[PDB]
Write an enzyme that holds these catalytic residues in place. Structure first.
Site, PDB file in Angstrom:
ATOM      1  N   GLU A 102      54.691  14.481  57.395  1.00 20.72           N
ATOM      2  CA  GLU A 102      55.634  15.560  57.662  1.00 20.72           C
ATOM      3  C   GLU A 102      55.051  16.535  58.679  1.00 20.72           C
ATOM      4  O   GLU A 102      54.705  17.672  58.364  1.00 20.72           O
ATOM      5  CB  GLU A 102      56.036  16.267  56.370  1.00 20.72           C
ATOM      6  CG  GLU A 102      56.731  15.354  55.381  1.00 20.72           C
ATOM      7  CD  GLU A 102      58.235  15.428  55.478  1.00 20.72           C
ATOM      8  OE1 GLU A 102      58.764  15.292  56.599  1.00 20.72           O
ATOM      9  OE2 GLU A 102      58.890  15.623  54.434  1.00 20.72           O
ATOM     10  N   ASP A 103      54.898  16.020  59.897  1.00 19.57           N
ATOM     11  CA  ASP A 103      54.373  16.725  61.072  1.00 19.57           C
ATOM     12  C   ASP A 103      53.245  17.688  60.713  1.00 19.57           C
ATOM     13  O   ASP A 103      53.254  18.866  61.068  1.00 19.57           O
ATOM     14  CB  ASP A 103      55.486  17.437  61.843  1.00 19.57           C
ATOM     15  CG  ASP A 103      56.447  18.180  60.951  1.00 19.57           C
ATOM     16  OD1 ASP A 103      55.996  18.933  60.074  1.00 19.57           O
ATOM     17  OD2 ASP A 103      57.661  18.100  61.197  1.00 19.57           O
ATOM     18  N   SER A 104      52.268  17.171  59.984  1.00 14.34           N
ATOM     19  CA  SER A 104      50.976  17.822  59.875  1.00 14.34           C
ATOM     20  C   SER A 104      49.998  17.168  60.840  1.00 14.34           C
ATOM     21  O   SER A 104      50.238  16.081  61.367  1.00 14.34           O
ATOM     22  CB  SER A 104      50.433  17.745  58.451  1.00 14.34           C
ATOM     23  OG  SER A 104      51.274  18.428  57.552  1.00 14.34           O
TER      24      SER A 104
END
Ligand SMILES: [Mg+2]
Ligand SMILES: [Zn+2]
Lengths: 216, 455, 142, 49, 69, 50, 358, 149
Positions: free
Chosen positions: C64-66
């Protein structure tokens, strides 16, 4: 020694500005070109050329692209020699080895995982209507395809126009006159033949006169 | 101090040396404490949940850290979202928080009656890679040391490997069984990996296209979005919740997540610019497909030129002509043939993410590789807004080419042209506007609906 | 989205930063021209660094777009810089002045404040100030 | 009796034609173009209405 | 503000040869000269920087505050 | 001011990176900021007195 | 047989044959020869040693080996009022922390006193770091070509206490010693990766899950060693890495031998089927030690029920779990023998290092 | 942090240089970007920039990647191959924690990344049980700036 000259003179001009020098207009204007020449030296220390990737074929900037090109296609790639669109739903396969006895199976999309495995490889698709393979569509005669489509377009537009309308007028698409049928399903099925060839020729004048009235 | 009815700071209690019964002590939050975790806007019932505190003693960390599978409760991602966290201190609130508002109660969605959480992204594809039959190297097996390593981080009691020699090979489906045995369930369903649209191309392994689990023993098939994905009704985590409670479902989500992630720690996963690159032969076939579409559009135009367009009763000619064109520029199912010819599904990262449901869908693969196609705004082509009969300054007045009305011929990987990008930006902005309307429009309806129904 | 994020990117926010007293301004020490530059960088200096990024699954810490960041790249100066804040206060009238509030008179001293490390009413430059400390000391009713 | 706010970089700004080094040592940005106003301790930009 | 003392990615001391590389690159511009018409592979190898993607990336792209102030 | 005939202009070697030179020329002409500074100068000079 | 086979030591040197490089060197630094400290690429061949031990040595040499850096004592950077407004203390401190130093003495303290009495921007180079502490430098510890910040005209910069600090690179990256340049297994066949069908794969013919390589080639680069004394510096670095690994393993060994006495590092449960569970929890321990322990316990106990370790990024600890069909003291003595195997392997590595480089 | 293709990312890990994955040549990343960030966002520009930057770093060049300039991903991949790398930008990568090579070749290369000015230290706020209160409603004041709420 352009560094010490540009710095000290800029301060003296700035100090002259605060003291309202009489020549400050001309002295600063000449310094702008003095600084601009000094500016390019700093710009040289920053920029590093022009650059582009070079095409070996044309030793200028590379312009090669995978972009799309129009390339108008023959009409036989869409409609068959009878005038109906191709349905590329049958998948044909060819064996990877010649020892395989079947070496070809023609299956629909659902049957692929049932009957096809690694021992075969996909080949070009087949149209389920006219039974032609995809890579052999050139065999179809264009002039026969066009003349079939012109009759298919004329008959389809005729029946699309007369989907509810009657050539003699007044709906009556159950049995009356020649609005719908001369028996059977001849009005939509289009493959019983010679019933559309007569009925459309019966009211060809009606089709011509209504199209121009609409196109006005 | 109940004896004084006053609150004392801790610096001035040297003479105390003890606390008397009846005193109230305000102590620092420790690991295991319950905390309320909330993201605004709080739209769903799961928007506020109770989590067990895990205090991070590193002074360089200032964020709230949560498992990725937990984000489905709050509709959150890690792109900059901020969520409130308050730790109950009252005994009544603390008793309540762990008994009633714990996130285990929000595992099953009140809205949909299905599970909320599951494997997302890194683990949905990780579960598929772990459980698939054949790797590009060969059969998907691992020796004892690497099978043991899959269970290092699961935080559960590790299984027994005494029956396996160091040279013994353990199948990918074997280790999942030794984790699913603790919560034995029966599951039999076709995985997301098997798709009809892909089947004519690619060679599906018959041991991968039927996921069957008998009493916690994965005996065939792969685990993907259908089985382990988040929000997958009837999935293995939904079944574990039904038989063994939602708390066991959450534990098996985490245990399976570590099992999948540890597998990719050795198998490795990536996406490359060549994963989205077509072969020159297939790119020659994508153009042939698109030219067939543009040929049909020009065939419609040639009917318009000769006045052959007879609209149906109830539709104007322009309405029918636009309706015919939108049907002409629809991408056929065969557009997947050039894409699958250029794709090695065993190793293609982009395809596996899409085919297993980890992220993306077929249009994303087609848009990236094959072609964008027609741009539709409110189920119609680009309207001539530049001038009378003009869609853009780049196209002539009353242009009949499909490109003038939004039909994009290029793909993303090929690079759109200047007018194709403008048409794409019209669709791109029109999606950004809809999002901003969605938040505000539903806010009025949500508040009106709440007050009408709250009593 | 890039048009939005390009204008928020940390970088050399102003070449005359040492002469300015600005609030919530971040000056990033190290900047790099993109390896794949565009025409826009002919007119505006680039903001950012050319970071070696690996598109891989590594421990599931980038879902999750980390982003998983090399701590060494952080320590070496990657995206490091200075963040500036201002503290401006003004005298209401002749009744107020700058100076250390004398503990004898007091009558309004802050609870649990430092009040040390003040010279001539101001904290000397180069001095670290923590949460409880007092800065720009001011008094009234003089 | 009046003063009109002067946009930085305009012909009525003291740094209109000053050298870039003079701007550097005067506390200004040598590379910035200007186009803003300095009012009550803050810099303001008049946008294109 | 300067070429980093060590490569950010791996820590190879490119700052040792940063000062030499700056002026060598400048002199290499003056014989080739609107961004980067050059190839600096030979100059970088001559300084002893290995064929490392990171070190060459940060050596040839890092802005210098003296060039812009 | 008739120009040379268009059948003789050589453009086969004109690339798009060459058209980036035209873009740079346009930006250099406008100055990327200059319109508002010039508008304020026009204000101070002609508009406020008018 | 011998574990650590012949080494390949090749320093990185400035190629003055390039006209631009020589011209620039003599123009700004007056440099005509090789710098006093040069980076050295050390490529090593390892045979008959597990991948865990070689990777542990590599990790130690990377960041877990103690190393020296130049730091500024607090209050060293004179805030003053003449100092350059652009050269902040944070920026110059970051510049100075990462100047590689080959310091054999910790008492050295340097001072930076640079004034720009001219109209040009004066750049402070590493040669401006003059030394006032204890022993005069017979040989420099850092190269004199490092660019420290520049001084605007009329500005200065005075930093008076630049001392040498000891630390490991895991905590602060300014102590990182060896940079990775090569790592491959020589006993695993490789595909031709330039081919299309094998371009998406790693190249090794054996899957990493089922591969147990014993022959490795490890390549490391050290950023600054004295030019006349390259071999002795490489020897010292490798021997110190081996010493560090042995010392940490012995620290684990103490916890093992204290097994009857209570301790919170080690716990023991005899669970159900005569199996005894040993959980070793050690704080501030890395993947090197846990991987070594797991691999060697697994080698010594092939029939083990379960061995595994986890260094969760938070909780900053190494937790090693062993489950075995044996009593508590039998398991303890097996683990002790495995640790003795690790010590033996790394002592043999140090012996080979002494034999080879010389 | 963000890329020039518009891929925001909050950093949650600080791995030491020994825990970072590395390639056969020793190259290791600074950021590790999830591959799932691509397929649904369709930010192919970032991948193409990574390919071209991989080729550029070895040649020591800086290419112009302006929008609408002619681009051929096939020819850029062939340029990668001619530069000594693979047709794709992937490399043989080793896990830094365990020293085990990954089965798949990992696509690692330079990508320009931007630090967005949204600092967690500014955004994070924690309050105790007492502080400034509104005189009218008796509730805490609003937000971090008022030191309570
Ligand atoms: Mg978000
Ligand atoms: Zn490097």
């Amino acid at each position: 020694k352009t560094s010490t000259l540009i710095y000290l003179r800029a301060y003296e001009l700035f100090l002259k500005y605060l003291q309202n020098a009489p020549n400050f207009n001309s002295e600063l204007a000449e310094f702008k070109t003095y600084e601009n020449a000094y500016g390019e030296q700093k710009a040289l220390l920053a920029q590093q050329g022009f650059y582009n990737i070079f095409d070996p074929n044309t030793g200028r900037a590379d312009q090669r692209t995978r972009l799309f090109e129009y390339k108008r296609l023959p009409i036989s790639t869409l409609y068959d020699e009878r005038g109906l669109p191709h349905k590329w739903t049958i998948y044909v396969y060819k064996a990877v080895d010649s020892s395989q006895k079947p070496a070809e199976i023609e299956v629909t999309r659902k049957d692929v995982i049932k009957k096809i495995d690694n021992h075969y490889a996909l080949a070009d698709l087949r149209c389920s209507v006219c039974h032609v393979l995809q890579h052999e569509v050139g065999q179809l005669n264009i002039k026969k395809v066009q003349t079939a489509l012109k009759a298919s377009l004329e008959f389809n537009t005729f029946y699309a126009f007369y989907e509810s309308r009657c050539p003699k007028g007044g709906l009556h698409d159950f049995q009356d006159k020649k609005c719908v049928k001369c028996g059977l399903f001849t009005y939509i099925i289009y493959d019983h033949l010679s019933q559309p060839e007569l009925v459309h020729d019966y009211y060809n004048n009606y089709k011509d006169q209504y199209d121009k009235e609409k196109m006005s | 101090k109940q004896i004084t009815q006053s609150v004392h700071d801790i610096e001035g209690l040297k003479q105390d040396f003890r606390l008397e019964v009846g005193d109230i002590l305000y102590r620092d939050v420790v690991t295991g404490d319950v905390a309320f975790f909330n993201r605004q806007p709080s739209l769903e019932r799961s928007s506020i949940g109770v989590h067990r505190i895990v205090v991070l003693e590193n002074p360089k960390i200032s964020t709230f850290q949560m498992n990725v599978s937990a984000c489905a409760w709050y509709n959150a991602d890690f792109d900059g979202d901020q969520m409130n966290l308050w730790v109950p201190w009252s005994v009544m609130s603390r008793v309540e928080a762990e008994l009633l508002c714990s996130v285990r109660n929000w595992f099953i969605s009140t809205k949909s009656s299905g599970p909320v959480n599951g494997q997302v992204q890194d683990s949905t594809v990780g579960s598929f890679l772990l459980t698939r039959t054949n790797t590009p190297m060969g059969k998907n097996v691992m020796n004892k040391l690497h099978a043991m390593g899959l269970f290092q981080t699961t935080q559960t009691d590790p299984p027994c490997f005494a029956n396996y020699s160091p040279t013994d090979l353990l199948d990918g489906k074997s280790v999942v069984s030794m984790l699913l045995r603790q919560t034995p369930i029966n599951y039999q369903r076709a995985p997301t990996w098997y798709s009809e649209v892909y089947a004519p191309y690619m060679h599906y392994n018959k041991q991968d296209i039927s996921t069957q689990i008998r009493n916690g023993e994965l005996i065939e098939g792969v685990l993907d979005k259908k089985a382990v994905g988040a929000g997958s009704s009837g999935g293995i985590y939904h079944l574990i919740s039904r038989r063994y409670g939602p708390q066991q479902a959450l534990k098996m989500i985490f245990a399976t997540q570590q099992l999948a992630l540890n597998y990719v720690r050795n198998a490795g996963f990536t996406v490359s610019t060549a994963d989205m690159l077509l072969t020159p032969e297939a790119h020659q076939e994508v153009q042939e497909i698109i030219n067939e579409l543009l040929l049909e559009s020009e065939e419609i135009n040639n009917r318009l030129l000769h006045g052959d367009i007879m609209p149906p009763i109830g539709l104007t000619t322009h309405d029918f002509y636009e309706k015919l064109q939108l049907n002409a520029l629809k991408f056929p199912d065969r557009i997947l043939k050039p894409i699958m010819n250029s794709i090695n599904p065993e190793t293609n990262g982009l395809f596996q993410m899409v085919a297993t449901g980890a992220k993306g869908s077929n249009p994303n693969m087609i848009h990236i590789m094959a072609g964008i196609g027609q741009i539709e705004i409110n189920t119609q082509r680009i309207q001539p807004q530049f001038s009378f009969g003009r869609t853009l300054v780049y196209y002539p007045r009353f242009a009949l080419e499909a490109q003038a009305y939004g039909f994009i011929c290029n793909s993303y990987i090929a690079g759109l042209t200047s007018p194709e990008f403008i048409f794409g930006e019209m669709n791109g902005r029109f999606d950004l506007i809809n999002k901003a309307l969605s938040t505000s429009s539903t806010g009025y309806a949500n508040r009106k609906a709440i007050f009408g129904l709250q009593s | 989205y890039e048009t939005n994020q390009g204008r928020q990117t940390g970088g050399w926010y102003c070449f005359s930063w040492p002469y300015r007293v600005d609030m919530n301004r971040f000056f990033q020490f190290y900047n790099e021209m993109p390896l794949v530059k565009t025409i826009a960088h002919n007119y505006v200096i680039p903001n950012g660094l050319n970071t070696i990024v690996a598109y891989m699954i590594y421990g599931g810490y980038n879902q999750e777009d980390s982003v998983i960041v090399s701590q060494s790249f952080i320590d070496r100066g990657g995206f490091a810089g200075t963040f500036y804040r201002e503290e401006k206060v003004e005298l209401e009238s002749d009744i107020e002045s700058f100076g250390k509030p004398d503990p004898l008179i007091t009558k309004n001293l802050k609870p649990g404040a430092n009040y040390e490390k003040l010279v001539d009413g101001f904290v000397p430059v180069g001095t670290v100030v923590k949460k409880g400390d007092i800065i720009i000391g001011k008094v009234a009713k003089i | 009796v009046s003063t009109f706010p002067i946009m930085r970089g305009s012909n009525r700004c003291h740094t209109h034609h000053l050298s870039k080094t003079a701007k550097k040592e005067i506390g200004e940005d040598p590379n910035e173009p200007g186009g803003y106003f300095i009012a009550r301790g803050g810099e303001w930009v008049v946008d294109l209405l | 503000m300067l070429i980093p003392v060590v490569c950010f990615t791996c820590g190879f001391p490119i700052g040792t040869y940063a000062a030499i590389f700056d002026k060598a690159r400048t002199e290499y511009i003056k014989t080739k000269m609107a961004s980067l018409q050059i190839e600096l592979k030979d100059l970088i190898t001559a300084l002893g920087i290995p064929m490392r993607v990171c070190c060459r990336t940060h050596l040839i792209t890092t802005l210098d505050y003296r060039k812009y102030y | 001011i008739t120009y040379g005939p268009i059948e003789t202009v050589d453009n086969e070697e004109l690339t798009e990176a060459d058209m980036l030179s035209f873009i740079s020329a346009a930006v250099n002409s406008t100055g990327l900021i200059g319109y508002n500074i010039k508008s304020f100068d026009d204000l101070m000079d002609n508009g406020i007195p008018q | 047989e011998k574990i650590f086979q012949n080494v390949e030591i090749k320093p990185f040197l400035i190629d003055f044959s390039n006209l631009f490089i020589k011209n620039a060197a003599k123009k700004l630094f007056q440099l005509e020869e090789q710098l006093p400290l040069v980076p050295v690429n050390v490529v090593m061949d390892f045979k008959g040693i597990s991948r865990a031990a070689v990777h542990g040595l590599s990790r130690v040499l990377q960041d877990e080996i103690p190393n020296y850096m130049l730091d500024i004592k607090p209050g060293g950077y004179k805030i003053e009022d003449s100092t350059d407004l652009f050269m902040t203390e944070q920026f110059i401190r970051n510049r100075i922390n990462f100047i590689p130093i080959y310091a054999k003495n910790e008492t050295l303290v340097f001072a930076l006193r640079s004034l720009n009495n001219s109209c040009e921007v004066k750049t402070i180079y590493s040669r401006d770091l003059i030394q006032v502490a204890g022993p005069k430098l017979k040989y420099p510890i850092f190269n004199p070509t490092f660019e420290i910040g520049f001084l605007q005209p009329g500005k200065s910069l005075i930093i008076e206490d630049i001392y040498i600090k000891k630390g490991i690179g895991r905590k602060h990256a300014a102590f990182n010693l060896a940079v990775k340049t090569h790592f491959s297994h020589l006993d695993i066949e490789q595909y031709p990766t330039d081919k299309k069908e094998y371009m998406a794969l790693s190249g090794y013919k054996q899957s990493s899950m089922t591969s147990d390589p014993r022959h490795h080639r490890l390549g490391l680069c050290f950023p600054a060693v004295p030019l006349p004394h390259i071999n002795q510096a490489v020897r010292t670095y490798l021997k110190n890495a081996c010493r560090i690994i042995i010392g940490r393993i012995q620290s684990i060994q103490k916890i093992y031998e204290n097994f009857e006495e209570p301790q919170p590092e080690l716990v023991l449960f005899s669970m159900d089927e005569e199996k005894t569970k040993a959980i070793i929890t050690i704080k501030d321990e890395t993947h090197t030690i846990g991987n070594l322990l797991k691999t060697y316990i697994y080698e010594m106990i092939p029939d083990i029920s379960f061995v595994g370790y986890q260094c969760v990024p938070h909780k900053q600890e190494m937790v090693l779990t062993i489950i075995h069909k044996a009593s508590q003291e039998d398991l303890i003595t097996l683990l002790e023998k495995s640790i003795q195997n690790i010590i033996q392997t790394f002592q043999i590595l140090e012996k080979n290092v002494d034999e080879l480089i010389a | 942090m963000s890329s020039r293709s518009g891929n925001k990312g909050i950093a949650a890990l600080a791995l030491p240089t020994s825990d970072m994955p590395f390639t056969e040549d020793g190259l290791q990343p600074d950021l590790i970007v999830n591959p799932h960030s691509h397929p649904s966002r369709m930010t192919n520009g970032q991948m193409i920039e990574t390919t071209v930057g991989l080729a550029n770093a070895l040649q020591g060049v800086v290419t112009d990647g302006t929008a609408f300039l002619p681009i051929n991903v096939q020819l850029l991949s062939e340029r990668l191959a001619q530069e000594g790398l693979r047709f794709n930008g992937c490399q043989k990568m080793f896990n830094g924690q365990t020293g085990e090579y990954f089965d798949a070749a990992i696509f690692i290369g330079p990508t320009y990344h931007q630090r967005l000015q949204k600092f967690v230290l500014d955004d994070r706020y924690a309050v105790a049980s007492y502080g400034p209160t509104d005189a009218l409603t008796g509730q805490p004041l609003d937000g971090k700036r008022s030191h309570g709420g």
